[PDB]
């Protein structure tokens, strides 16, 4: 329940479009560098519900000892007054039933019991699995990221990872309200805060991002987002006004 | 033949070149509404349907195909005219009583209803196209690949001119055409018997 | 007077200065279609008629 | 080989979309060579030197 740092935990692809070999701006949703997260862990005696806050996106994490975590529910009323997302992953497949819920008290499994109207069903098919969760134009964009999670007394690594961009659902429903679905049996889940911000990101010949910016924190990361580059020569430049 | 196109309009692309162009995906959103709010669907205009039921993006690439039939729908029809805030784009929303009172009003559809008060069904078009395997393509029949001609070239609607050499670029599994020096495409890859072709 | 005349486009020039113009020369296509398909009569678009 | 010619009916009690519409479509040029068709505007005195 304690706080933690966004050790350059949070950058995603922003765009569908293939890009190589180029450095190139963006205004995007972002989870800027040194930010604050509200992790919580799993004792004898834990949390039961809890309604956090969809803020135009949220950036998912866990540690998932053994499979703790079982998916999201997405809403803005969390009833059967309107529609909701649960997501689950139960046995092996990922499905996604955009229904009336009347769900229960807390989402477990061994979580919905009645459900009508659905407009939406599909089914698809020490580990990090972090995710990040926005809302765009009627779509769900989905960018999760399958680390291999280093080893409590638990923290965020450095080592920087360009999630990747996962399927996407034209859902179409507004959200603003989110919850977690675990496994009650008779681990740790992370959130972050999305926010607008300008980021520089860079690319390689394969495509992939090789390291990132985030020209709202730093007077150095201003001066790179000004000079357009990743080097910067020796001396002094005016800078512009991303702060 | 039988289909009457009241409005096609497409925004980004142009009715002339829909045959030339293969789409990596189409979403097709259908509704039906009254003849005088067609002109209502367009990216960056407001009214009852454009605020209170169905809002379109502003970076909106895709076409609106709206076609006038007061015979195949009679009855009663239901809209929303009473939201405290306007949708965002490509939104849904189905609270009846968001405001307590009823916010669904209805509407009725008679073949002997004046003008502007009659069906019309609706289909908008959205589609995407960027560097991926497209799955929705036009009808145009392929034709045989010839190499070291000045030749016009229609890979997947990417059309130019140039000279196709059997070429070994690395391209990963979903690329289709390689970008180089100034943004020019100049590493391609031919949808049948797949190889890379640079030009 | 007795005709209404339900779409007059001009490109090129405009309705408010064909009277100032005198043309070198002018034809006339004439013919009849449907009430839904006059849209498709413009530069740079397709249908049946187009 | 078969009839590429499909028939279209015209009727006072049909819908709005297939009822007949008469189009002319105005095609003239305008440039150097002396105007036949020409506007409905009178002359005026030539006057010189203003
Ligand atoms: C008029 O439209 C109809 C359907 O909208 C077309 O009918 C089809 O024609 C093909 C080949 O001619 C047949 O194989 C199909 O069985 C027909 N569909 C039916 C009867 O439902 C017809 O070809 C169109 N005619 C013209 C001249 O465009
Ligand atoms: C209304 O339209 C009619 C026909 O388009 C015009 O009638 C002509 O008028 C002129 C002079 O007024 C006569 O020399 C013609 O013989 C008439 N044509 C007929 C009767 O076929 C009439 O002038 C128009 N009226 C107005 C007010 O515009
Ligand atoms: C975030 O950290 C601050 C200390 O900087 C602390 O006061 C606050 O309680 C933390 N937030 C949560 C949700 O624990
Ligand atoms: C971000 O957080 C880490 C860990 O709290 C801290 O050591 C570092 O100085 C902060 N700032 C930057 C720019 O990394
Ligand atoms: C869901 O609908 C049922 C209808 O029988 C109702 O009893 C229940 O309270 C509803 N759930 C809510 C409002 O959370
Ligand atoms: C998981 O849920 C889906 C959705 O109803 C169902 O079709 C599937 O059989 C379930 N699988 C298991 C193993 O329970
Ligand atoms: C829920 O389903 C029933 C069964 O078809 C339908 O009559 C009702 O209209 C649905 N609810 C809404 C809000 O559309
Ligand atoms: C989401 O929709 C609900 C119901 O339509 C509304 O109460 C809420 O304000 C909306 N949230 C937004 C638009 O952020
Ligand atoms: C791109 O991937 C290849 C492996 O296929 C690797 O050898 C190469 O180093 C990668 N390029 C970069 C810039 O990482
Ligand atoms: C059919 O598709 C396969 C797969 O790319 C291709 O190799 C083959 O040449 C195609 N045949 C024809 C006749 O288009």
Sequence with gaps: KQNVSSLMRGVYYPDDIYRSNVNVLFTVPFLRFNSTLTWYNFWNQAYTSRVMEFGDGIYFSTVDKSNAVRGWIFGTTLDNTTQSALLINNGSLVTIQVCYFQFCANPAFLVYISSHNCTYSEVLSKRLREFVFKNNDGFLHIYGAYQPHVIATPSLPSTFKPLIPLWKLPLGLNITNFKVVLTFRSANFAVGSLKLTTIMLSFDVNGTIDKAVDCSSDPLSELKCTLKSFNVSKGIYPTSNFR | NSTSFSTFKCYGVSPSKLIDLCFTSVYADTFLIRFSEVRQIAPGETGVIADYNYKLPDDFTGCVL????????????????????????????????????????????????????????????????????????????????????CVNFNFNGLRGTGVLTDSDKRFQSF???????????????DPQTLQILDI
């Design chain 2, 66 to 149: 709206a076609w006038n039939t007061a015979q195949q729908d009679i009855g009663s029809y239901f809209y929303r005219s009473h939201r405290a805030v306007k949708l965002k784009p490509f939104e849904r929303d189905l609270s009846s009583d968001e405001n307590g009172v009823r916010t669904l009003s209805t509407y009725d559809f008679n073949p002997n209803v004046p003008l502007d008060y009659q069906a019309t069904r609706v289909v908008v078009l959205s589609f995407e196209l960027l560097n991926a395997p497209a799955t929705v393509c036009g009808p145009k029949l392929s034709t045989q690949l010839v190499k070291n001609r």
């Design chain 2, 175 to 189: 690329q289709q055409f390689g970008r180089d020096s100034a943004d020019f495409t100049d590493s391609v890859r």
